[PDB]
Amino acid sequence: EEYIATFKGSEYFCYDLSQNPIQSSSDEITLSFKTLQRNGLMLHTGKSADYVNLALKNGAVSLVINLGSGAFEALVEPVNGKFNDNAWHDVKVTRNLRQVTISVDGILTTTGYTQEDYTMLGSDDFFYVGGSPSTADLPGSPVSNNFMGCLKEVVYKNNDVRLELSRLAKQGDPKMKIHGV
Ligand SMILES: [Ca+2]
């Protein structure tokens, strides 16, 4: 059973981190996405200088991460055809301390490091999936559009926690809320 959610441009999931803050020196994020749109927020967590932002930005997969001492921005461009071709594309983001790697469809990979010395991502805000109350204003966001398309199997995990966000949205949770205009 996969857990697939459809977004139409005015919707998002919102997982409440206030009582179980993210405090992570190494993370992984996986999902698959399907869309016809060039721009859209896939996922975000964090405020101020600690954040992770994942989005399609003019057809490329865009990831911006900051651990509090300066952001890294990774773009993955398509090679043959397009990511917004309404076929499923798998995303994987792996971070160990400051080392960041994102791969799309296994093969297409951009790797780098967040700036300077900070290794810890802190977030007691919300984990957003598919959009947010005001996407343009999210730290590190290159887009203002919520997602319009499908997202499945969204998982954030570190050594302490595993957040099966797509499963939680589908199955229900006290900390999980679905918003639609
Ligand atoms: Ca930090």
UniProtKB/Swiss-Prot annotation:
Name of the featured protein: Neurexin-1
Post-translational modification remark: O-glycosylated; contains heparan sulfate. Heparan sulfate attachment is required for synapse development by mediating interactions with neuroligins and LRRTM2.
Quaternary structure and partners: Interacts (via laminin G-like domain 2 and/or laminin G-like domain 6) with NLGN1 forming a heterotetramer, where one NLGN1 dimer interacts with one NRXN1 dimer. Also interacts (via laminin G-like domain 2 and/or laminin G-like domain 6) with NLGN2, NLGN3 and NLGN4L; interactions with NLGN1, NLGN2, NLGN3 and NLGN4L are calcium-dependent. Interacts (via cytoplasmic C-terminal region) with CASK (via the PDZ, SH3 and guanylate kinase-like domains). Interacts (via cytoplasmic C-terminus) with CASKIN1 and APBA1. Interacts (via laminin G-like domain 2) with NXPH1 and NXPH3.
Subcellular location(s) of the protein: Presynaptic cell membrane
Residues bound to Ca(2+) 1: 50, 67, 120
UniProt family annotation: Belongs to the neurexin family.
Laminin G-like domain sequence ranges: 4-181
Role summary: Cell surface protein involved in cell-cell-interactions, exocytosis of secretory granules and regulation of signal transmission. Function is isoform-specific. Alpha-type isoforms have a long N-terminus with six laminin G-like domains and play an important role in synaptic signal transmission. Alpha-type isoforms play a role in the regulation of calcium channel activity and Ca(2+)-triggered neurotransmitter release at synapses and at neuromuscular junctions. They play an important role in Ca(2+)-triggered exocytosis of secretory granules in pituitary gland.
